[PDB]
Every structure is written in C-alpha cells, then in structure tokens.
C-alpha cells in the first residue's frame, strides 16, 4: 500500500502552503 | 523520565524539502511511531514550530511506517542536526510555554525539558 505515502505527499503540499501568510524577513 | 522513554521508543529525526530555486524544509521528530515535534523553515520567512498536543491539526497524523520517510534515501538525520536548529529557532521556550499552559502532549521531548 502506497496510498499512505500519497497522503503524506498531500499533507506536505498543504503544509507548504501554510507559510504564504507569514511575513517576509526582508520586508 | 527520559530513559524509560528512550529505552522503549526509538527517537528518529527526518528532514525533507518542500515541493515547488530555494526550497523550504520540513523537519520532524518521531517519538517511536508518532510525531512529537515538527519544524518548517521557508526561505525569507520566520520558522514554524509545532508540538504534539497544541499543534496537532498542523502536524503529520500518519504512523512513521506509513509516511515512507524511512524509505527515502537521505531523509533521516542525526538527533543533534534536528536539535541544533530547533533550539536556534526558539524551540525550547516554545515547548516549555506549551507545557506550562497544559497544551503539550507528554512525549520524549517534554521529558527532555522536565530537567
């Protein structure tokens, strides 16, 4: 079974989006 | 207590880049099969620190065996490689505050701060 690793992939993609709300250090 | 945890649950640490250039990084500390700490470092952003209990909704819900992390060549790292970055980002105060406020689930990491 590698549905679960697919699930881990989807999880990482949503986490990767979780930072776009964060301020830039540069400005 | 730290040893009883140690001596029954292997502590394992991983780091992998995020998908789309500079990459962001996803770090994890697994206390046996279940995640205890998670840390996300994006270019030109403040770090995201996450501890079991308080931040469950943002953390990996999979058993370690299910993630495929143990089968990705190069994903596993030394405990100290995780710790140095966790500590640099303020992870000790973060977890300590979560413990103080009764938001942190007891893990090997909290046992580490019981000192």
Residue numbers in the entry:
A (entry chain C): 437 to 463
B (entry chain A): 1158 to 1177, 1188 to 1282
Q: What text does the study give?
A:
Myosin VI is the only currently known unconventional myosin motor that transports cargoes along the actin filaments from the plus end to the minus end. As a unique myosin motor, Myosin VI can not only serve as a processive dimer or oligomer for vesicular transport and cargo sorting, but also function as a nonprocessive monomeric anchor or tether to link its binding cargoes with cytoskeletons for the establishment and maintenance of highly specialized cellular structures. A previous study revealed that Tom1 can directly interact with Myosin VI through its uncharacterized C-terminal region, and was proved to be a crucial adaptor to mediate endosomal localization of Myosin VI12. In this study, we systematically characterize the interactions of Myosin VI with Tom1 and three autophagy receptors, NDP52, TAX1BP1, and Optineurin, and discover that the C-terminal region of Tom1 contains a conserved Myosin VI-binding motif shared by all Tom1 family members, which can specifically interact with the C-terminal CBD of Myosin VI to form a stable heterodimeric complex.
We purified the C-terminal CBD of Myosin VI and Tom1 MBM complex, and successfully obtained good crystals that diffracted to 1.80 Å resolution. The overall structures of two complex molecules in the asymmetric unit are essentially the same, except that the flexible extreme N-terminal α-helix of Myosin VI in one complex molecule is unsolved due to the lack of electron density. In the complex structure, the C-terminal CBD of Myosin VI features an architecture assembled by a 4-stranded antiparallel β-sheet packing with five α-helices, and particularly, one surface of the 4-stranded β-sheet is covered by three helices (α3–α5), while the other side is capped by the short α2 helix. Intriguingly, Tom1 MBM in the complex structure mainly forms a continuous α-helix, and packs extensively with the solvent-exposed side of the 4-stranded β-sheet of Myosin VI containing the α2 helix (hereafter referred to as site I), burying a total of ~827 Å2 surface area. Further detailed structure analyses of the binding interface of Myosin VI/Tom1 complex revealed that the specific interaction between the C-terminal CBD of Myosin VI and Tom1 MBM is mainly mediated by extensive hydrophobic and polar interactions. In particular, the hydrophobic side chains of F444, F447, L448, and A452 of Tom1 occupy a hydrophobic groove formed by the side chains of I1173, F1175, W1193, C1227, L1229, T1234, and L1236 from Myosin VI, and concurrently, the hydrophobic side chains of Tom1 A454, A455, L458, P459, and L461 residues pack against a hydrophobic patch formed by the side chains of P1213 and I1215 together with the aliphatic side chain of K1212 from Myosin VI.
